[PDB]
Automatic annotation (TrEMBL):
Organism per entry: Thermosulfurimonas dismutans
CDD domains per the UniProt record, alphabetical: beta_Kdo_transferase_KpsC_2 (cd16439)
InterPro entries in the cross-refs: Capsule_polysaccharide_synth (IPR007833)
Protein's name according to its UniProt entry: Capsular polysaccharide export system protein KpsC
One GO BP: polysaccharide transport
Length: 296
């Protein structure tokens, strides 16, 4: 009777059980959470993303809430998740409230050994992964799905791709702006971007770019690993740490971090990793090795 899930689908419950083998039951309403809590003194609730904030539901302090989300490595370039994020304080894309990732990076107790792995992971990612000929600075803007939670709780001002593309052009009047729209979703876009790169190879649009300008896209964290300068127009999890030139300052972040500190925190300590083959907990490096040995 260790963990409970909040409004998870059956398929999602089985996936979560890989990371939490002690999942016991699925609570389907706030009343069921309150009834079970005073029945057992305290409960551990598994919630997905900003589900509680979207419902404006708050529980007493005896309901320990874990906010779940997909990992970072399963997504950045290289279906059944190999990585899972379990945040007991908040969630990484919510810049309005503290997150456990933010507390890790602030405490920044990173010994010499974990900095080595972070440098190995950076080198590993860069290796496991059209362009206009002009004199202008090449700027790339990855579009997002506007209904995403990272824009709602992670962008303090800009909320649309059009406002992003607008704001990008206002700050860069002469640069060559190419808009890469999000796959999962035109005439007014071209009034601020030069061309619209509708396909060819995401991560291999980064290498042709001089700078990457994003709102809250995880795409910008991949650009940091690739070493390309990135400007943030919102407040993603990698913003505020001086690695990115932030348009709007983060109201709660003062620390200047290195790329290894960011990687060691965001990729190595923050998310969980479970092997796809045997189901055991593995390191972020073994997770990359498994995904790398999966494609060939």
């Amino acid at each position: 009777e260790d963990f409970y899930t909040y409004k998870f689908s059956l398929w999602k419950i089985r996936i979560i059980k890989r990371f939490f083998p002690t999942v016991k039951g699925n609570l389907s309403s706030r009343q069921e959470v309150e009834d079970l809590c005073q029945k057992k003194g305290k409960i551990r609730l598994l919630v997905w993303g900003s589900t509680l904030e979207n419902e404006r539901v708050n529980f007493n302090k005896s309901v320990e809430v874990y906010r779940l989300e997909d990992g970072f490595i399963r997504s950045i370039g290289l279906s059944i998740p190999i990585s899972l994020v379990a945040d007991p304080i908040g969630i990484y894309y919510d810049a309005t409230k503290p997150s456990y990732l933010e507390e890790i990076l602030l405490a920044r107790k990173f010994d010499n050994v974990i900095l080595e792995r972070a440098q190995r992971v950076i080198e590993l990612l860069r290796r496991y992964k059209r362009p206009p000929r002009t004199d202008k600075k090449i700027i790339v803007v990855p579009g997002q799905v506007e209904s995403d939670a990272s824009i709602k709780f992670g962008s303090p001002y800009i909320k649309t791709n059009l406002e992003l593309l607008k704001s990008v052009r206002e700050h860069n009047p002469n640069a060559y702006i190419v808009y890469k729209p999000h796959p999962d979703v035109p005439g007014e876009l071209l009034k601020f971007c030069d061309e619209i790169c509708v396909n060819s190879s995401s991560y291999d649009i980064i290498s042709y770019a001089d700078e990457v300008h994003v709102l809250t896209s995880l795409f910008g964290f991949e650009a940091l690993i690739a070493g390309k300068p990135v400007t943030c127009y919102g407040h993603p999890f990698y913003a505020g740490y001086g690695l990115t030139t932030d348009i709007y300052p983060h109201p709660r972040r003062n620390i200047k971090l290195s790329l290894q500190e960011l990687v060691a925190g965001a990729l190595l300590l923050y998310p969980m990793y479970v092997s796809l083959i045997d189901g055991n907990r593995i390191s972020a490096e073994e997770a990359i090795f498994e995904l790398v040995n999966l494609k060939k």
